[PDB]
Amino acid sequence: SNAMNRIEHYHDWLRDAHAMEKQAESMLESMASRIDNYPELRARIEQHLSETKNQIVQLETILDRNDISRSVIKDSMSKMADEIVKGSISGYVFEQFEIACYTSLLAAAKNAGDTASIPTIEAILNEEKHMADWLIQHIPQTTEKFLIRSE
């Protein structure tokens, strides 16, 4: 037996989530800088970048509550880890990764007893769901625009 293995897993996933948000922040900045001629899509990506910068700040508060720090290695490795249509699809898929990871993290925080952090995790998760919903709603419009312009 070692009960402390559960807490080690929780702390590892908190560090994973922090690294994931660094990856998101890089991805969103890159996408925004590259998009031309899709004003709504670009602006929503720019808004989510702002949201993601705050998600990092919020995760750092959770790390602090648990008396741990980010992994600099993981933060760095996560930053190493047709186009408008494919890129929209890619963006959606990354938000769904975030959704899955935060859903798992809610269960982990519950298991660990870190009740005080659950409403922050929920706040983040709700922002990812809102972004994923926006994107999947706009994918058909984007696909139509792309096809119209291909002619």
| Contacting residues toward a copy of itself, per CB under 8 A | 1-3, 5-6, 9-10, 12, 82, 85, 88-89, 92-93, 96-97, 99-101, 103-104, 106-108, 111-112, 135-136, 139-144, 146-148, 150-151
Q: Which residue is nearest to Fe ion (CB)?
A: 128
Among 24, 31, 108, 125, binds Mg ion (CB under 5 A): 24
Separation CA 24–CA 135 (nearest Å)? 15
SS3 34: helix
> How big is the site for Cl ion, counted in residues (CB under 5 A)?
3
If one asks whether residue 45 binds Cl ion (CB under 5 A), the answer comes out as: no
Stretch that binds Mg ion, among 23-31, 41-49, 65-73, 112-120 (CB under 5 A): 23-31
What would the two tokens of residue 9 be? 């897993």
With b for 16 or more beta-carbon neighbours within 10 A and e for fewer, the 115-145 pattern comes to: eebeebbeebbebbbebbebbeebbeebeeb
Q: Closer CB to Mg ion, residue 11 or residue 22? A: 22
- Backbone φ and ψ of 36, nearest 5°: -135, 145
If one asks whether residue 25 binds Fe ion (CB under 5 A), the answer comes out as: no
